Every structure is written in structure tokens, then in C-alpha cells.
Design a protein around this nucleic acid. Structure first.
Ligand code: NA
Ligand code: NA
Length: 95
RNA sequence: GGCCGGCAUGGUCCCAGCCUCCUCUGGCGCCGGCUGGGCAACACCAUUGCACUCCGGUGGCGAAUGGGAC
């Protein structure tokens, strides 16, 4: 149900009908206040659909990005967000 | 999107209209067969999925007009 506080927040239960680049921008449009986002990862695959990965620089940013945006409607769909199971490749490059 | 066959139709331009997965001298008379490339768009079904490798599948072409200048 919940993982240990990661740099990336695993957001799922998103709108499938929305295109990749459009959704990748609209998420940034409402998430660019908690902290500096490195890159959002959006896929259109079979199982990889419906979810996204918002990589945050500061951990405290992703901490407040999860608790505030939880259940917030997005394209007529409530956002089900979690912490990432493992650190992202960009974060792995840091330390 | 490409081929074939049966039939029907005097023929060349002009205005506007109309069609579609497959360029907006593209195509737009009926009936019947053969067959391809791609899911990019649109639709629908499946999927509640932890990724850093791009990657589910299917339908649609079984489509579309009159009038005029000679
Ligand atoms: Na041929
Ligand atoms: Na698809």
C-alpha cells in the first residue's frame, strides 16, 4: 500500500484517453509548486498505462506533493499517488 | 491502399456539394470476387498496472452528387 519516502512519487489511476505529451505537461502544470521536477515519465504500453513517475529533486517536495494532491481530480479522475518502490535513474546518478 | 470479373453508360470542361485507417489526373454508375501495409489518427474491448528499452488487440473501402456551359 505504501513504500518508504522516495525521491520519485508513483502516481497511478490517471486518465488513459489523454495523450502522452499533453498529460506530461498538465501534471507539471499542477505539480510545479512543491519542488523542482527533474522529469515526468509517462508510458502508453499495455500494463505501463494509467500510471506516471514524477521525479522530485528534494525529498521534502515529494513529501508535500503526495499529501496535498492525494485524491485530487485530474481529467475527471481522482489521483491515486504513492511513493516509488526504488530510486529513479537520475537520483541513482547522484548518490 | 493495389488487382480482377460481369453489366450498364454518347462524350470534354464549369459551379458548388459529398466520401475516407491508408496524398485533399485522389475518388464519387450497379453487382460480384482476389489481396497488402499500418495501428499514426478516430473508435471500441481488455487492462488498477513500479518504470527508467520502443512494444495489448480489433473495426472502419461494407464509402460518397445534383445541376449547368457547350
Ligand atoms: Na497487384
Ligand atoms: Na493502440
Amino acid at each position: 500500500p505504501e513504500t518508504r519516502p522516495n525521491h520519485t512519487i508513483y502516481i497511478n489511476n490517471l486518465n488513459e484517453k489523454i495523450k502522452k505529451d499533453e498529460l506530461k505537461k498538465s501534471l507539471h502544470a499542477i505539480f510545479s509548486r512543491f519542488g523542482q521536477i527533474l522529469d515526468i515519465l509517462v508510458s502508453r504500453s499495455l500494463k505501463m498505462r494509467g500510471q506516471a513517475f514524477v521525479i522530485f529533486k528534494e525529498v521534502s517536495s515529494a513529501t508535500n506533493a503526495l499529501r496535498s494532491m492525494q485524491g485530487f481530480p485530474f481529467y475527471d479522475k481522482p489521483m491515486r499517488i504513492q511513493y516509488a518502490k526504488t530510486d529513479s535513474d537520475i537520483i541513482a546518478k547522484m548518490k
